[PDB]
Design a protein around this ligand. Structure first.
Ligand SMILES: NC(=O)c1ccc[n+]([C@@H]2O[C@H](COP(=O)([O-])OP(=O)(O)OC[C@H]3O[C@@H](n4cnc5c(N)ncnc54)[C@H](O)[C@@H]3O)[C@@H](O)[C@H]2O)c1
Ligand SMILES: Nc1nc2c(ncn2[C@@H]2O[C@H](COP(=O)(O)OP(=O)(O)OP(=O)(O)O)[C@@H](O)[C@H]2O)c(=O)[nH]1
Ligand SMILES: Nc1nc2c(ncn2[C@@H]2O[C@H](COP(=O)(O)OP(=O)(O)OP(=O)(O)O)[C@@H](O)[C@H]2O)c(=O)[nH]1
Ligand SMILES: Nc1nc2c(ncn2[C@@H]2O[C@H](COP(=O)(O)OP(=O)(O)OP(=O)(O)O)[C@@H](O)[C@H]2O)c(=O)[nH]1
Ligand SMILES: Nc1nc2c(ncn2[C@@H]2O[C@H](COP(=O)(O)OP(=O)(O)OP(=O)(O)O)[C@@H](O)[C@H]2O)c(=O)[nH]1
Ligand SMILES: Nc1ncnc2c1ncn2[C@@H]1O[C@H](COP(=O)(O)OP(=O)(O)OP(=O)(O)O)[C@@H](O)[C@H]1O
Ligand SMILES: O=c1[nH]cnc2c1ncn2[C@@H]1O[C@H](COP(=O)(O)O)[C@@H](O)[C@H]1O
Ligand SMILES: O=c1[nH]cnc2c1ncn2[C@@H]1O[C@H](COP(=O)(O)O)[C@@H](O)[C@H]1O
Ligand SMILES: O=c1[nH]cnc2c1ncn2[C@@H]1O[C@H](COP(=O)(O)O)[C@@H](O)[C@H]1O
Lengths: 481, 131, 81, 71, 87
């Protein structure tokens, strides 16, 4: 009736100071009494903001133009916009990430009935948006005249727009002050979807579109804030002129910012956390790269709402070998997540993650989320271009410190296809390995971590040469993706 | 000697060395003596060990071009002091005081964690040190 | 108000005789309250001689003819022939 | 173009050409524009083709350092 | 390609012909007595979803109405005459 406990507990590993990383250990299997896809993944990003899935795209220029932010926020995660570009560009990026799906659209493009129809085609090319309401003065402060539609422009141009729009007598509409559950039903039951909202004075105040009900059906896991639009993040630097960049990003409606730094503990960074949290009380803020609890204290005292952790460990990085300063990633994530947990702040494990097993390890060590670089580079919506080189469809991967001194390299990665199929493979690999561990949710997994129920063993170098070994002539993987 | 990146210079200084001394890292700079030969498509310059021609206790090899030492030494200086900033020391004298006072703290980097930065996780790459 | 000390001190590394080299260890980061180019580098070479920078060229025949001694002494260091 | 050695220059002059125009043989000299990067232990400098970014009719590559055009 | 059973190759060439059309001459059609879960079945089986309704559920019958993907945003169970648009 007694079975000996086997394997080192969580704390017994990182007592002997050998500086372990994700390769150096395993997690012993448990007991299974649930289906592989039953388990929950809800995870905090910062004190007030929570995600339906623990995946984040890294704010590198070679990873996160707006198209990845969209395609990752649509599947639980969150996307941080790279900062090494002019503030006006970064504000535009975060603006068109916010506007991909909407609740009450509160600032539509609208037109006066006197326009030429070639100006509708101009607006459609300039905005992508194409089902436009018409008002007498061509602004929100006017009576509703009609709607014009992509379905109205199958016809050279030249016509005055009142000839081709559909008029206010014939379209359906709802009264203002309606909540976004009755207006939704009224659009569903008036089965022709572009329903405008007007006050009792019959003037335009907002509109709703069926396409976003279609997006809600299609992407049930997407992370949307109170106004029912995608959550968006920006990196910003710590410099005196990023104080201007902040205002444009906030006027564009960013929800979270990460104070991007190689070494988070600086007096410049701690002063900037105060400036952000005094001027803009709503914004959640994430602290710059820390590796030891002795430097997490300054960030949490400043008022930061989460931390990102790890330095010099990374694929593209060379900071350990230029600065001499760093810490092995597996030790760092645990030894700071145990401390930061006392104050209730989340931790996000920053980079050095190159297979699904490294994500399950990072989460079973106290990280509230992981953050991805190379594993999302060369997906379809990672920005730029592909070039065939020595017969491989590879796409660039630039480190920010890679062009006073250079502390990253610049390189390239083979194609991985659309992030829309890749993220579900990470989710179905994490939750399927969380089954073998024996945890019904990630909150239960970190409870097992801190209770001693999980048990690890050190994988000596001779045992790292296991799986896909020096015991095949040649081989092919095929992750179903 | 045994110093082959700016991180090894900061480690040697934060361990009690008053100075470092360079070999291979200054070989194939412009004012290192002799001549360049293109070999297998590389503008490399000779590197001879003094024990490499009674027994031989050094090899004779070659190193790729690093340009003028007049730009290379400021890159070493601006890499040392920029890493001494991350350590938290305002001078090398303060750094060795931290060494001998216990304020500096190290960790052992197990072999698996030496495979970090510029890793087995890229197809191919180019560094571009400012040099 | 208390934060646990993390990491081996200087002496605790080289007590266990595993013969570490520069690759085998890291230096944990501290607190930053100065600009990266503020730091001083003045370093002794020998009891009576001090240099504005801690770099020396090795006295190998393949490294130090006079032209390197000049170009390195001109930038803080020193050159051995 | 297609000149990649001194012998090809002499052949091109002894065939009628009044002068010879050099591409690759002057790339990666010191005053060719841009930057040098270590790829695989080589101090090489970029060599972009104009038809290498509608279709692409050139490649983009790199060449090992040749020192000053003055020598 | 021909190295597969004739029935498969006939299906392939059939669904290559039917990707765009002039007068669709043999559409999928339904009787107004069907359950709406059979419209979802037909949409999954054919990809085509804007389906006309006729009294005997075949081309040899009077029109009754049309059903479209815009009519299936709602468990199933309903008789199809409740949710069509009528003739
Ligand atoms: N872990 C990493 O190493 C890592 C990760 C992601 C990005 N990066 C990138 O690498 C660069 C590394 O430098 P950094 O992280 O110190 O940020 P940085 O680029 O803003 O700082 C550059 C230099 O100026 C100093 N500095 C920073 N803010 C300052 C201020 N307000 N006033 C005065 N001096 C200031 C820093 O000490 C540093 O020496 C960053 O630009 C960052 O985008 C590094
Ligand atoms: N016009 C519009 N309506 C939405 C959108 N998203 C959700 N709705 C619906 O509006 C309602 C939102 O109110 P809530 O009750 O807080 O949201 P919910 O019930 O949790 O539904 P989900 O957030 O989609 O999981 C739900 O019925 C949603 O299905 C959207 O993006 N646009
Ligand atoms: N109404 C409106 N939607 C906008 C605007 N900017 C972005 N959008 C988003 O764009 C989505 C799709 O636009 P639709 O006009 O519905 O697209 P569509 O013309 O019907 O054609 P499809 O794209 O084929 O559905 C909307 O549901 C909004 O989420 C804007 O100014 N007005
Ligand atoms: N319902 C339907 N109508 C079409 C289709 N293709 C073309 N039409 C239109 O029906 C007419 C076909 O008659 P034709 O005069 O012989 O074709 P066309 O003028 O050469 O036009 P294209 O073949 O499209 O270049 C044209 O107006 C076409 O634009 C189709 O695929 N479906
Ligand atoms: N009408 C009809 N079209 C068919 C059939 N089989 C294939 N198709 C083709 O499928 C095309 C698109 O089908 P639609 O019914 O228009 O697609 P939809 O369901 O309205 O939805 P969208 O694809 O979003 O426009 C048609 O235009 C035909 O070319 C069939 O049995 N009937
Ligand atoms: N509120 C409304 N009430 C009724 N009809 C409307 C309303 N708004 C637009 N319409 C009209 O109904 C028709 C269908 O509009 P809808 O918005 O569904 O077209 P659409 O989605 O742009 O078409 P498509 O997908 O083919 O591009 C058009 O003639 C349009 O002008
Ligand atoms: O140039 C650089 N120098 C140092 N660290 C960088 C640089 N660029 C990116 N990083 C780090 O690399 C991570 C990307 O994840 P990775 O691909 O696993 O290495 C980022 O999130 C940063 O932490
Ligand atoms: O022939 C040799 N045998 C052994 N050591 C040598 C020889 N020549 C030079 N050295 C050492 O190599 C150092 C040069 O630095 P290195 O390039 O890092 O090896 C010199 O300063 C000497 O300590
Ligand atoms: O992108 C390109 N496509 C085609 N020809 C080019 C391109 N760029 C330059 N050229 C030509 O190619 C020659 C290259 O010279 P070479 O490198 O010495 O062979 C140039 O002198 C031009 O005549």
């Amino acid at each position: 009736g007694y079975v000996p406990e086997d394997g080192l507990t969580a704390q017994q590993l990182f007592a002997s100071a050998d500086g372990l990383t994700y390769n150096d250990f395993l997690i012993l299997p448990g007991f299974i009494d649930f289906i592989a896809d039953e388990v929950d993944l809800t995870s905090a990003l910062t004190r007030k903001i929570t995600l339906k899935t623990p995946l984040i795209s890294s704010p590198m220029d070679t990873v996160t133009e707006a198209d990845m932010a969209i395609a990752m926020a649509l599947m639980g995660g969150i996307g941080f916009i790279h900062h090494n570009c002019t503030p006006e560009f970064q504000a535009n990026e975060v603006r068109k990430v916010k506007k991909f799906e909407q609740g009450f659209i509160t600032d539509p493009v609208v037109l006066s009935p006197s326009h030429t129809v070639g100006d509708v085609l101009e607006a459609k090319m300039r905005h992508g948006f194409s089902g436009i309401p018409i008002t007498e003065t061509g602004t929100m402060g006017s009576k509703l005249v009609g709607i014009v539609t992509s379905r109205d422009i199958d016809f050279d141009h030249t016509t005055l727009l009142s000839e081709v729009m559909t008029p206010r007598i014939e379209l359906v509409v709802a009264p203002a002050g309606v909540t976004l559950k009755e207006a939704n039903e009224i659009l569903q039951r008036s089965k022709k979807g572009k329903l405008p909202i007007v006050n009792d004075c019959d003037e335009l105040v907002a509109i709703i579109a069926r396409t976003d009900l279609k997006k809600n059906r299609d992407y049930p896991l997407a992370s949307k804030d109170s106004q029912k639009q995608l959550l968006c993040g920006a990196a910003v630097g710590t410099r005196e002129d990023d104080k201007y960049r902040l205002d444009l990003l906030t006027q564009a409606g960013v929800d979270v910012i990460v104070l991007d730094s190689s070494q988070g503990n600086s007096v410049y960074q701690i002063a900037m956390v105060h400036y952000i949290k005094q001027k803009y009380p709503h914004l959640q803020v994430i602290g710059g790269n820390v590796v030891t609890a002795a430097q997490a204290k300054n960030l949490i005292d400043a008022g930061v709402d989460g931390l990102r952790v790890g330095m010099g460990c990374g694929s593209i990085c060379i900071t350990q070998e230029v600065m001499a300063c760093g810490r092995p990633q597996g030790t760092a994530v645990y030894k700071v997540a145990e401390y930061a947990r006392r104050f209730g702040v989340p931790i996000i494990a920053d980079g050095g993650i190159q297979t699904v097993g490294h994500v399950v390890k990072a989460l079973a060590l106290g990280a509230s989320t992981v953050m991805m670089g190379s594993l999302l580079a060369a997906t379809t919506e990672a920005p730029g271009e592909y070039f065939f080189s020595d017969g491989v469809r590879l796409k660039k991967y630039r480190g920010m410190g890679s062009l006073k001194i250079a502390q990253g390299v610049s390189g390239s990665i083979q194609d991985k296809g659309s992030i829309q199929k890749f993220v579900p493979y990470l989710i179905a690999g994490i939750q399927h390995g969380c089954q073998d561990i024996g945890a019904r949710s990630l909150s239960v997994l970190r409870s097992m971590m801190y209770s001693g129920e999980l048990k690890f063993e050190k994988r000596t170098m001779s045992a790292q040469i296991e799986g896909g070994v020096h015991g095949l002539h040649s081989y092919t993987f095929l992750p179903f993706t």
